C-alpha cells in the first residue's frame, strides 16, 4: 500500500474506522519507512478529530484547528485540502511527499478536486504513493451503503419552505435531527419555522462551520440545519437525518456567467454521506433516514470541475507538463489541459483574488485573464445592465474607494458572490476596495 506508483482507495463503509483506526496504523508504518508524508483533512473540524486519533505520533500540524507542541523533527505534515492546493499555487516550496493521504477524498470543492489531480498524476508518473480514504469514491451508485447499526430508510415528502400542516412527523420527534437543505436561504426559512414551533436549532454552512459546529457539542439542540458541507466527516450524536436530496449546482452559461441552477438532485455519493451521519452507533439501532427525492449525476457539467482545471493549469508539475484530473472524475468537464495557464503576473493576480479577495475561482480567473490588477475594482461597476446585483429588489449600491455612490454591476457575473446576505456583504466590501 505504501510502495511507489501505488494509488489505493480505502472504501470502507461510513463509520467503519477509517479516521480513528486505519489512519494511525498507516502513519506508524509511514514513519517506520521514513516516508515524507502529507495528511489532507477536508475541514478544520476533521483536522482536530485527526489530532485526537494521532496523539503521541510525531505529526507537524500546519493548521490553526489544533494547538500542539512540535519537536521540529516531524516528517509527517497535516493540513487542509485547500491549504495544500494554496501552497502549490503560491511561490512557497512544497516538499515532494513520498506518501499522500487524503481523508474524505469525495470532497467536490475545486481545491480538493485539484489536489486529487496533482497527487494522482504524481502517482501515475511513478514518483509517489497515495491513499484516498472515502466510503463514496467518484462514480459510486449506491446511496444506501452498510452502516454500524441498521437504519430505517423512508421515502417521504420533505418540506423546503415553512409549513402550517401536513408534516406532523417532523416535529412530533423527541430525538435530535440533522436536516440537509439545498441552500443557506432555504435553511433560514426552515429554521425560523422550527424555532417558532419551540425547537432549538443550530445552522451550519461553509462560512460559519467551525464556529457553529462547536455549539452542537457545547449546548442541547433539537435540529441541526445544514448545507452539503456536513457530508465531509462532520459527526453528530443524532438519531435521525432528514434529507431534501437536493443541492444548488454552479453552472457556467455561455462561457460568460455563473448561475446557481436548481435546486436539483444530489449525487449517490452525497446521498450516502448525508445518510451516513446516522446508524454509526452499533448499540443504537433504528436511526431514521427520511429522504425527499431521488439521486442523479448532477456533478456532470458542475462548475467545480472546470474550476479545478483552472487551478491545475496554474500549478507547476515538471517543465510545461500539466497535472490531469483524477481519472474517475476527469470526464465531468469538457476542458483542454493547459487552456487556463496564465503568464507570471496574471497568475499572481489570480492567486491574490482567491486568497485575499475571497472570490470564486471562475470569477478570479476572468479578472486575472483580462489583465486587471488586484486592487483595480472598476470592473465591479462597468458590466451590462443585466449584471446588476439586487438587494431587496432594488439595485445594490456601494461607495467606491473614490468616494462615489455606484450601483453594483460587475463586468462578469457569478451568482455565488450574492447567493446570501453574508456573501453579498463580503462582495460589497471587495467592490469598495476594503480588502
Ligand atoms: C508548523 C507550521 C508550518 C506552517 C504553517 C503552520 O500553521 C504551522 N503550524 C503551527 O505553527 C502550529 C499549529 C498548531 N499547533 C502548533 C503549531 F506550532
Which residue segment(s) compose the domain that 14 sits in? 7-133
Q: Are residues 201 and 98 in the same domain?
A: no
Q: Are residues 173 and 73 in the same domain?
A: no
Pocket of ligand 1 contains residue 152 by CB under 6 Å? no
Q: Are residues 163 and 261 in the same domain?
A: yes
Protein residue with least CA distance to atom 11, ligand 1: 62
User: Could you tell me the distance, in angstroms and rounded to a whole number, from the CA of residue 63 to the centre of ligand 1?
Assistant: 6
Pocket of ligand 1 contains residue 22 by CB under 6 Å? no
C-alpha dihedral (176, 182, 188, 190), degrees to nearest 10: -50
Quote the cell numbers at residue 58: 510525531
Q: Are residues 11 and 120 in the same domain?
A: yes
In sequence order, what are the residues at sequence separation of 6 or more whose Cβ sits closer than 8 angstroms to the Cβ of residue 337? 309, 312, 313, 322, 324
Protein residue with least CA distance to atom 6, ligand 1: 62
Q: Are residues 166 and 108 in the same domain?
A: no
Pocket of ligand 1 contains residue 87 by CB under 6 Å? no
Quote the cell numbers at residue 343: 503568464
Protein residue with least CA distance to atom 10, ligand 1: 62
Pocket of ligand 1 contains residue 69 by CB under 6 Å? no
Beta strands in 239-368 (DSSP E): 240-243, 246-253, 257-265, 287-291
User: Could you tell me the distance, in angstroms and rounded to a whole number, from the CA of residue 65 to the centre of ligand 1?
Assistant: 10
Q: How many beta carbons lie within 10 A of that of residue 327, not counting itself?
A: 15
Sheet holding 257-265, edge to edge: 246-253, 257-265, 413-414
For a ligand 1 pocket test, name from 50, 60, 67, 69 the mutation site with the most ligand atoms within 8 angstroms of its C-beta. Answer: 60
Strand partners, 240: 177, 288
Q: Are residues 128 and 161 in the same domain?
A: no
Q: Are residues 168 and 211 in the same domain?
A: yes
Alpha-carbon gap, residue 310 to 292, rounded angstroms? 35
User: Could you tell me the distance, in angstroms and rounded to a whole number, from the CA of residue 166 to the centre of ligand 1?
Assistant: 52
Q: Are residues 125 and 156 in the same domain?
A: no
Q: Is 17 annotated as a binding residue?
A: yes
379, HSE (Cβ side, Cα atoms, 13 Å) = 20
Contact 160, 191 (CB under 8 A): no
Closest to 77 measured CA to CA, from 107, 47, 52 = 47
Protein residue with least CA distance to atom 5, ligand 1: 62
Alpha-carbon gap, residue 433 to 435, rounded angstroms? 6
User: Could you tell me the distance, in angstroms and rounded to a whole number, from the CA of residue 78 to the centre of ligand 1?
Assistant: 10
Alpha-carbon gap, residue 109 to 360, rounded angstroms? 11
Q: How far is CA 96 from CA 100, 327, 360, in A?
A: 10, 21, 28
Q: What is the resolution of this structure in A?
A: 1.7
Helix ranges, 281-396 (H): 303-312, 344-355, 361-369
Pocket of ligand 1 contains residue 95 by CB under 6 Å? no
Residue 274 is part of a domain; what is its CATH number?
3.40.50.300
Q: Which atom of ligand 1 is nearest to the CA of 69?
A: 16
Alpha-carbon gap, residue 112 to 39, rounded angstroms? 13
In this structure, what are the phi and psi dihedrals at residue 314, rounded to the nearest 5 degrees? -110, 20
Pocket of ligand 1 contains residue 283 by CB under 6 Å? no
Q: Are residues 123 and 170 in the same domain?
A: no
Protein residue with least CA distance to atom 16, ligand 1: 68
Contacts 24+ apart (CB under 8 A), 52-58: 53/19, 53/20, 53/23, 53/24, 54/23, 54/24, 54/27, 54/78, 57/24, 57/27, 57/28, 57/31, 58/31
In sequence order, what are the residues at sequence separation of 6 or more whose Cβ sits closer than 8 angstroms to the Cβ of residue 215? 202, 221
Distance between first and last Cα of the chain = 45
Q: Are residues 46 and 165 in the same domain?
A: no
Amino acid at each position: 500500500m505504501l510502495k511507489k506508483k501505488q494509488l489505493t482507495v480505502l472504501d470502507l463503509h461510513p463509520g467503519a474506522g477509517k479516521t480513528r483506526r486505519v489512519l494511525p496504523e498507516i502513519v506508524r508504518e509511514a514513519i517506520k519507512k521514513r516516508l515524507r508524508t502529507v495528511i489532507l483533512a477536508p475541514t478544520r473540524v476533521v483536522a482536530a478529530e485527526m489530532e485526537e486519533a494521532l496523539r503521541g505520533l510525531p505529526v507537524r500540524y500546519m493548521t490553526t484547528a489544533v494547538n500542539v507542541t512540535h519537536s521540529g523533527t516531524e516528517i509527517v505534515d497535516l493540513m487542509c485540502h485547500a491549504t495544500f492546493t494554496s501552497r502549490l499555487l503560491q511561490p512557497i516550496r512544497v516538499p515532494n511527499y513520498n506518501l499522500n493521504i487524503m481523508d474524505e477524498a469525495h470532497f467536490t470543492d475545486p481545491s480538493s478536486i485539484a489536489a486529487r489531480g496533482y497527487i494522482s498524476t504524481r502517482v501515475e508518473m511513478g514518483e509517489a504513493a497515495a491513499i484516498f480514504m472515502t466510503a463514496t469514491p467518484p462514480g459510486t451508485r449506491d446511496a444506501f451503503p452498510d452502516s454500524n447499526s441498521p437504519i430505517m430508510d423512508t421515502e417521504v415528502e420533505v418540506p423546503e419552505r415553512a409549513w402550517s400542516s401536513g408534516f406532523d412527523w417532523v416535529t412530533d420527534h423527541s430525538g435530535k435531527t440533522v436536516w440537509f437543505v439545498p441552500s443557506v436561504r432555504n435553511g433560514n426559512e426552515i429554521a425560523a419555522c422550527l424555532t417558532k414551533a419551540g425547537k432549538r436549532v443550530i445552522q451550519l454552512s461553509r462560512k460559519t462551520f467551525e464556529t457553529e459546529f462547536q455549539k452542537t457539542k457545547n449546548q442541547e439542540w433539537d435540529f441541526v440545519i445544514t448545507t452539503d458541507i456536513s457530508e465531509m466527516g462532520a459527526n453528530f450524536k443524532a438519531d435521525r437525518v432528514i434529507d431534501s436530496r437536493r443541492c444548488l449546482k454552479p453552472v457556467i452559461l455561455d462561457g460568460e456567467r455563473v448561475i446557481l441552477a436548481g435546486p436539483m438532485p444530489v449525487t449517490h455519493a452525497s446521498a450516502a454521506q448525508r445518510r451516513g451521519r446516522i446508524g454509526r452507533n452499533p448499540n443504537k439501532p433504528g436511526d431514521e433516514y427520511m429522504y425527499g427525492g431521488g439521486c442523479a449525476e448532477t456533478d456532470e457539467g458542475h462548475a467545480h470541475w472546470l474550476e479545478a482545471r483552472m487551478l491545475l493549469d496554474n500549478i507547476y508539475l515538471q517543465d510545461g507538463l500539466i497535472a490531469s484530473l483524477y481519472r474517475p472524475e476527469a470526464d465531468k468537464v469538457a476542458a483542454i489541459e493547459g487552456e487556463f495557464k496564465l503568464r507570471t503576473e496574471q497568475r499572481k493576480t489570480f492567486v491574490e483574488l482567491m486568497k485575499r479577495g475571497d472570490l470564486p475561482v471562475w470569477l478570479a480567473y476572468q479578472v486575472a485573464s483580462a489583465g486587471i490588477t488586484y486592487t483595480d475594482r472598476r470592473w465591479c461597476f462597468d458590466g451590462t445592465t443585466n449584471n446588476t446585483i439586487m438587494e431587496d429588489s432594488v439595485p445594490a449600491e456601494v461607495w467606491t474607494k473614490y468616494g462615489e455612490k455606484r450601483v453594483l454591476k460587475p463586468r462578469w457575473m457569478d451568482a455565488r458572490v450574492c447567493s446570501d446576505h453574508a456573501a453579498l456583504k463580503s462582495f460589497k466590501e471587495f467592490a469598495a476596495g476594503k480588502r
